[PDB]
Amino acid sequence: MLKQVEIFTDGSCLGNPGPGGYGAILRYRGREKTFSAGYTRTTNNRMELMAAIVALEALKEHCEVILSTDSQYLRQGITQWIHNWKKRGWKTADKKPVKNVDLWQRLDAALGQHQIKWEWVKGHAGHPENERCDELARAAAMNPTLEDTGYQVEV
Numbered sequence: 001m002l003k004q005v006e007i008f009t010d011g012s013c014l015g016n017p018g019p020g021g022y023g024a025i026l027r028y029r030g031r032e033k034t035f036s037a038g039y040t041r042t043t044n045n046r047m048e049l050m051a052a053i054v055a056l057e058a059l060k061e062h063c064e065v066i067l068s069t070d071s072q073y074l075r076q077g078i079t080q081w082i083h084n085w086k087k088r089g090w091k092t093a094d095k096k097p098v099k100n101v102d103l104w105q106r107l108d109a110a111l112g113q114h115q116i117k118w119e120w121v122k123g124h125a126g127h128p129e130n131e132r133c134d135e136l137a138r139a140a141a142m143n144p145t146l147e148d149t150g151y152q153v154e155v
Contacts, residue, residue, distance in 0.1 A: 002027055004117075005063040007055045008126075010133030011047025011071060012141050017151060020044060021140020022051035023133035026058055033058060038140035042148035045073040047137065049103040056110035068119040070130060075120050077104060102150035 006027040013020030021038035035054045039047070048071035055067075069075075082104065085091075090101050098104060121130055 001030055003064075005059060005065045006129075007052075007065060007067040008129035008133050009048070009051030009055060009067065009069045009071065009074075010130060010137040011044060011049070011051045012134070012137035013042060013044035013047055014141055017041045017043050017153075019141050019144040020047040020148075021137050021142075021144065022047045022054070023136025023140065024051045024055040025129045025133060026055050028059060028063075034136070036136040036140045037146055038142065038144035039146050039148040040144040042151050046100060046103060046148060046151060047141075048073050049077075049100065049107055051133070051137070053103065053107050053110060056107075056114070059114065062113055062115075064115045064117075066117045066119060068121055068127065068130060069133075070121045070123040070126055075118075077107075078118060082108065097155055099155075100150070 008025040009022065011020065011022040019038060019040055020042045021036060024035040026033040026035065052067065052074060085098055085104070090098055090105065092098055121127070
């Protein structure tokens with residue numbers, strides 16, 4: 001039985017916007033859960049956040065997590081922006097809401113329930129589970145079934 005929860009995420013999009021999807025692998029309890037869905041019109045950044053979100057929302061108790069991903073958007077959010085965004089009320093310097101505020105707030109809610117250890121992998125040097133997320137993400141985007149409600153060309 002693993003002593004820490006292991007999560008792997010990937011997200012993919014064919015256009016901007018275009019159809020996209022995500023793949024997340026979750027090692028929780030004695031199982032490996034696999035999550036993946038395609039969206040008719042979204043963006044690569046929105047899918048990368050969705051991967052992380054659906055994985056964490058599955059955890060039903062406070063856990064010790066190790067989340068592994070090569071997603072740069074997630075990385076920059078987590079390491080440079082999120083902190084300052086909470087202090088500023090989720091607004092940009094020109095007082096508009098941040099881009100993808102729907103997802104980042106959603107994600108933030110999921111992250112505050114756990115002790116998280118982030119492992120930023122290089123795209124060409126992750127683990128087998130990262131490669132498999134990539135494969136899932138791509139397959140999903142080719143057969144999109146859901147609508148990405150928070151997507152805006154806009155705000």
